Amino acid sequence: MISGILASPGIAFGKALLLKEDEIVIDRKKISADQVDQEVERFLSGRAKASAQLETIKTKAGETFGEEKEAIFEGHIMLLEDEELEQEIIALIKDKHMTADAAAHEVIEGQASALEELDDEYLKERAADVRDIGKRLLRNILGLKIIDLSAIQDEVILVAADLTPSETAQLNLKKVLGFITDAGGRTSHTSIMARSLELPAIVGTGSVTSQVKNDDYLILDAVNNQVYVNPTNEVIDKMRAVQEQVASEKAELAKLKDR
DSSP states (O other): OOOOOOSBOOOEEEEEEEOOOOOOOOOOOOOOHHHHHHHHHHHHHHHHHHHHHHHHHHHHHHHHTOGGGHHHHHHHHHHHTOHHHHHHHHHHHHHSOOOHHHHHHHHHHHHHHHHHTSSOHHHHHHHHHHHHHHHHHHHHHTTOOOOOGGGOOSOEEEEESOOOHHHHHHOOTTTEEEEEEBSOOTTOHHHHHHHHTOOOEEOBTOSGGGTOOTTOEEEEOSSSSOEEESOOHHHHHHHHHHHHHHHHHHHHHHTTTOO
16 A cells, blocks of 8 residues: 555566664763874874765766766865864864764754755755765764665665665666655655656655565555565466566557557
């Protein structure tokens, strides 16, 4: 009964790939002047990584969708390498004895919160794009593990509460079989992918992430706008024939030569 908004029609079979995230724990402990010097190297040299990460993703955005998307990630690096937000972070770590994780979170706490005080969905939706830049920066300071979605080797379905341009900029469109997310969809960056690529997808799933686990066997219908979870062979075998009869009845468009 999973009623979504249906992005594009089509039918695909594959295992559920649930993208879960480990909650990050920030340490609010005060360090000693003997560990402050290390925070700067962890942050200074750390930025060497975050700068290299987004940079590497920046080229994937231009080599995957094309140039016009590089300008968006190009400014996202300027904000991260901002010499101004740099002096403020440093000072805090040294003046408030804050950890690069805590101090870095403070600045990012006002950049996102301050944009929420604006009355414009454009600068606001930027708040979500800005927080995403801090999240990665945090996982880099703690060297936390990063989810490598651009390294899939088995064809499966993609399930997630929602995906940000970055994830979509590095996603692999050669091993993915479809995109399923519970995001309103009105103007969800996901839909724009499913629409320009005409591939089949759904976005208003709502709580499928609370009904499916990863590895779960699913079947996307994108015809009746419905997803089947753990279906009996009777329904699979029965659809496999009719279903493929559609792709073949579609290849009947290849037969659009009789006319």
